[PDB]
Design a protein around this ligand. Structure first.
Ligand SMILES: [Zn+2]
Ligand SMILES: [Zn+2]
Lengths: 148, 154
């Protein structure tokens, strides 16, 4: 399957992220997000795509396996933990990745969200490291939709 | 509880907008409730389309959600699309408030897809119009929302 997520939020920060399930156990994720402060910004899929209350109603990190926060490449990680994304000097974050635990059929209807700052991939030894990665505040989210 | 919920915030090319929530009471009953404002008073077709891609506004949503390859019809017709929710009447203040059940539309089907409100009435495939058995000829799409997974108000 194929998907897309139109990000946005309070003021700056907004972009587009598409998902394409190339095969039954590996997914391609490509997207661009402008308006971000140069530097790393965590990226995660949250349980819901309900933006009624903006990104506050998006629920928490999509985590079916009941794991703990981790890195994309980590094993013990939330299915929705896409780790970080780097916003170059221009404040533009462009990326492409092949996460193989996050499937298009498992995240449609949900949401993609970028945070204030860097995700410490559950290794920051902060009360929130193992929970969110202490990525800070959610500044942009989009509902992961079905696409052609 | 196993009550699946989905919410669809409507936004578009015009004034029209609202929120429609979906609730899968039982596997055969899906409560659909919503309020859409900014509509001209009168009937307005409501359908679930196959894609939720709003990258090209309400155009990239594709067509009405129609797995069974049926033709367009009213919400109560057997020969209809799964996403055919039929009409929705916006009152004098240009507001559409509606609550209804649909036993053919399942929450788990429409997630990720989109809810669209049309310019005009849905002839429910009986207009004898080239588009009747396709779109019900409900006119143009003035607003659409991406059906999203939701907690649901309990
Ligand atoms: Zn996480
Ligand atoms: Zn139809």
């Amino acid at each position: 399957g194929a998907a897309v997520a139109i990000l946005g939020g309070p003021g700056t920060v907004q972009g587009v992220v598409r998902f394409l399930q190339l095969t039954p156990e590996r997914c391609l994720i490509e997207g661009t997000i402008d308006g971000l402060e140069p530097g790393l910004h965590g990226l995660h899929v949250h349980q819901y795509g309900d933006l009624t209350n903006n990104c506050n109603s998006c629920g928490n990190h999509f985590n079916p396996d009941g794991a703990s926060h981790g890195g994309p490449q980590d094993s013990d990680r939330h299915r929705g933990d896409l780790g970080n994304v780097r916003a170059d000097a221009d404040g533009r974050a462009i990326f492409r990745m092949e996460d193989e635990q996050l499937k298009v059929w498992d995240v449609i209807g949900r949401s993609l969200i970028i945070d204030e700052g860097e995700d410490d991939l559950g290794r920051g030894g902060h009360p929130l490291s193992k929970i969110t990665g202490n990525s800070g505040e959610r500044l942009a989210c989009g509902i992961i939709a079905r696409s052609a």
